[PDB]
């Protein structure tokens, strides 16, 4: 038709002169133009590459040099080249064999990287080939055992992976870490997922904490407040900053209580460890410790300020300044004004961080607004009084902090969900804890004294009294708006005791009838803060007969995040096999003879007071004197 033939003849006599002429050997001429298409360039050129048979590691060393030759005033090739290197490198067969092609490209990053690229666009593609590597040269150690018997006599076996130079990632680290202002919303993402790597040593988490990187991710978020992607970028830092917070006790505790709930929940140590893989993860020795300590023997029997709080927290009160409430130029969605959806993610990582670690919560109480430091900080009031106070689709956008600010009162109050165990009604709070309570406790009971005395400060604030007389009622009760997700009820029960022996022993219902008798009734809303008043006492009356005998937007817990990052890197689920040999050299290597040999030897041995006080009581009947529906009324007889 259209060639001297069409017999396979030809079509193979005109791939061959494709091949030693024309793209094969021009991508690099062509490629730069096309930035978008670099993935479907890889598939393309993997294929012509697999009818010839040629090695695909030689071409891409290829393309490592041609990186090396390019300088770095072309930016959008040498991005272009990085990111068709680093889709080469992801394939697993080319990375079985490109080992010495790894450590030439970390030699030229150390070599040309510097913290003055962060904008430019190749950097980011550097740092995704970069964490190609790191991910897998993050892997637990593949050991192998000789001393000990095997039930199969072989094992799960997997191709040795590239171990980076440790002086070669410390460097890379420093050069990372030194990044100035970022304007780049990619590499921001980017810096973010390495040091969600690189934060999982305690001192690494350290030294990000202290370098204020976090602080221009911030600022990165902030500003593209109204990208797409934006949730990414979201996701990762909040991964980030709950690493940088966490410390190795709370790590091992954690580890700990979740190899004790799958125990208690004799099973096969691959289901244990493809369960719990982002528990291996977090930090895979702490867990093979624990394994060894707990379990004996495929089956197993079942034998300091830091300063993130304050830019977080400095930054939710700048936010709320500006107008948080007005809807944009052109059904109901309060992320759609750019501030009110970043003080979303604000308010969504302090309850987390909140709940979450009780250095959070030290570093909330001790929040100043000037920032003095000192060498033991003192409380104050900075933080609660902020959130007590200051915080048809504004209505909406209002309710919804409201709860996000009810929620990090709540969890700021509950206890942190550290070594969870069986629920102990231990009845003894940490000092620590009750402290924080009595703190707010009186903080509020400040606030409600204040507002209701002069009329006009009631009419001015009558709202605020009736949101706090709702938050006193929730803490009672310790839940609130996806709050209760990150708590333990192992120990939420101490928390819905201790709490409210507090809210007595300060004399807070009785602060909560003085409020409540200090309004004319004459008001229209009198009704609704009589109600809520009413409510928060009914609460508290009916949390200490539950303890009669002493008396007479998704959030998630620190394991689901941890599970999270998991899935952003090793998104199998199967690298956990990894890890078995070295409990097998702990555990089955010398327990499996010294166990048994038990087990024979044993088998051989075979062969109340006053809640309210009196003016209180007239305050509460003042209540008969407001015409309700009867709806209203069962919170009364009760």
């Known amino acids: 038709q259209y060639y001297k033939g069409c017999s396979s003849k030809e079509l193979d006599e005109l791939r061959d002169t494709f091949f030693n002429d024309g793209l094969p050997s021009r991508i690099f001429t062509v490629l730069p133009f096309y930035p978008k298409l670099v993935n479907a360039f890889a598939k393309t050129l993997l294929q012509i590459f697999?009818?010839?048979?040629?090695?695909?590691?030689?071409?891409?060393?290829?393309?490592?040099?041609?990186?090396l030759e390019?300088?770095?005033?072309?930016?959008?090739?040498?991005?272009?080249?990085?990111?068709?290197?680093?889709?080469?490198?992801?394939?697993?067969?080319?990375?079985?064999?490109?080992?010495?092609?790894?450590?030439?490209?970390?030699?030229?990053?150390?070599?040309?990287?510097?913290?003055?690229?962060?904008?430019?666009?190749?950097?980011?593609?550097?740092?995704?080939?970069?964490?190609i590597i790191l991910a897998k040269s993050e892997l637990p150690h593949l050991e192998e055992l000789s001393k000990d018997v095997l039930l199969r006599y072989p094992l799960l076996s997997m191709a040795k992976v590239f171990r980076i130079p440790d002086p070669m990632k410390q460097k890379l680290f420093d050069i990372l870490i030194r990044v100035s202002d970022i304007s780049n919303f990619y590499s921001a993402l980017a810096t973010s997922?390495?040091?969600?790597?690189?934060?999982?040593?305690?001192?690494?988490?350290?030294?990000?904490?202290?370098?204020?990187?976090?602080?221009r991710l911030l600022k990165v978020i902030g500003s593209f407040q109204k990208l797409d992607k934006i949730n990414f970028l979201e996701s990762s830092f909040l991964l980030l900053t709950r690493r940088c917070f966490e410390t190795t006790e709370n790590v091992d505790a954690l580890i700990r209580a979740e190899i004790n709930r799958s125990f208690t929940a004799v099973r096969e140590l691959t289901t244990i460890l493809e369960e719990k893989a982002h528990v291996v993860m977090r930090?895979?020795?702490?867990?093979?410790?624990?394994?060894?300590?707990?379990?004996?023997?495929?089956?197993?029997?079942?034998?300091?300020?830091?300063?993130?709080?304050?830019?977080?927290?400095?930054?939710?009160?700048?936010?709320?300044?500006?107008?948080?409430?007005?809807?944009?130029?052109?059904?109901?969605?309060?992320?759609?004004?750019?501030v009110c959806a970043y003080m979303i993610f604000l308010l969504k990582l302090l309850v987390e961080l909140v709940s979450s670690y009780n250095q959070c919560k030290f570093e909330f109480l001790t929040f100043s607004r000037r920032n003095t430091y000192a060498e033991r900080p003192r409380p104050r009031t900075t933080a609660i009084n902020f959130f007590l106070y200051r915080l048809k689709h504004e209505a909406k956008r209002r309710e919804v902090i409201g709860?996000?600010?009810?929620?990090?009162?709540?969890?700021?109050?509950?206890?942190?969900?550290?070594?969870?165990?069986?629920?102990?009604?231990?009845?003894?709070?940490?000092?620590?804890?009750?402290?924080?309570?009595?703190?707010?406790?009186?903080?509020?009971?400040?606030?409600?004294?204040?507002?209701?005395?002069?009329?006009?400060?009631?009419?001015s604030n009558h709202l605020k009294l009736d949101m706090w007389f709702r938050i006193i009622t929730?803490?009672?009760?310790?839940?609130a708006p996806y709050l209760r997700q990150l708590?333990?009820?192992?120990?939420?029960?101490?928390?819905?005791?201790?709490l409210c022996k507090l809210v007595i022993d300060l004399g807070l219902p009785s602060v909560i009838?003085?409020?409540?008798?200090?309004?004319?009734?004459?008001?229209?809303?009198?009704?609704?803060?009589?109600?809520?008043?009413?409510?928060?006492?009914?609460?508290?009356?009916?949390?200490?007969?539950?303890?009669?005998?002493?008396?007479?937007?998704?959030?998630?817990?620190?394991?689901?995040?941890?599970?999270?990052?998991?899935?952003?890197?090793?998104?199998?689920?199967?690298?956990?096999?990894?890890?078995?040999?070295?409990?097998?050299?702990?555990?089955?290597?010398?327990?499996?003879?010294?166990?048994?040999?038990?087990?024979?030897?044993?088998?051989?041995?075979?062969?109340?007071?006053?809640?309210?006080?009196?003016?209180?009581?007239?305050?509460?009947?003042?209540?008969?004197?407001?015409?309700?529906?009867?709806?209203?009324?069962?919170?009364?007889?009760?």
């Open 50 to 67: 697999t009818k010839y048979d040629e090695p695909t590691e030689v071409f891409a060393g290829r393309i490592l040099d041609r990186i």
């Open 70 to 131: 390019t300088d770095l005033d072309d930016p959008a090739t040498l991005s272009s080249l990085i990111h068709l290197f680093g889709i080469f490198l992801n394939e697993k067969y080319i990375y079985q064999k490109a080992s010495h092609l790894m450590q030439r490209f970390i030699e030229y990053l150390e070599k040309s990287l510097k913290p003055e690229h962060v904008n430019t666009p190749w950097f980011s593609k550097a740092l995704y080939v970069y964490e």
């Open 193 to 215: 997922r390495i040091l969600i790597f690189y934060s999982r040593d305690e001192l690494y988490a350290n030294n990000i904490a202290r370098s204020g990187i976090l602080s």
């Open 283 to 338: 930090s895979p020795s702490q867990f093979i410790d624990v394994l060894c300590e707990t379990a004996r023997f495929y089956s197993l029997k079942r034998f300091e300020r830091t300063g993130i709080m304050h830019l977080l927290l400095s930054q939710l009160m700048a936010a709320s300044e500006k107008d948080w409430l007005s809807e944009p130029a052109n059904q109901l969605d309060p992320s759609r004004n750019p």
């Open 403 to 459: 709860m996000l600010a009810r929620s990090v009162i709540i969890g700021f109050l509950a206890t942190v969900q550290d070594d969870r165990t069986t629920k102990t009604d231990v009845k003894l709070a940490d000092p620590h804890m009750n402290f924080i309570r009595k703190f707010a406790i009186e903080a509020i009971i400040k606030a409600i004294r204040n507002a209701t005395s002069s009329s006009k400060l009631l009419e």
């Open 474 to 479: 929730s803490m009672v009760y310790v839940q």
């Open 487 to 498: 708590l333990d009820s192992n120990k939420v029960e101490a928390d819905q005791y201790q």
């Open 513 to 638: 009838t003085e409020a409540m008798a200090s309004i004319d009734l004459n008001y229209p809303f009198s009704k609704k803060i009589f109600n809520v008043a009413v409510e928060a006492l009914n609460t508290i009356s009916s949390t200490r007969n539950n303890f009669s005998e002493h008396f007479k937007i998704i959030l998630k817990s620190t394991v689901s995040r941890w599970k999270d990052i998991f899935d952003m890197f090793y998104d199998s689920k199967t690298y956990a096999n990894c890890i078995i040999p070295t409990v097998i050299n702990r555990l089955y290597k010398v327990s499996l003879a010294l166990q048994k040999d038990l087990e024979n030897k044993r088998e051989q041995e075979k062969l109340f007071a006053p809640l309210i006080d009196r003016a209180g009581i007239a305050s509460l009947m003042k209540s008969v004197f407001i015409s309700k529906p009867y709806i209203q009324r069962e919170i009364y007889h009760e």
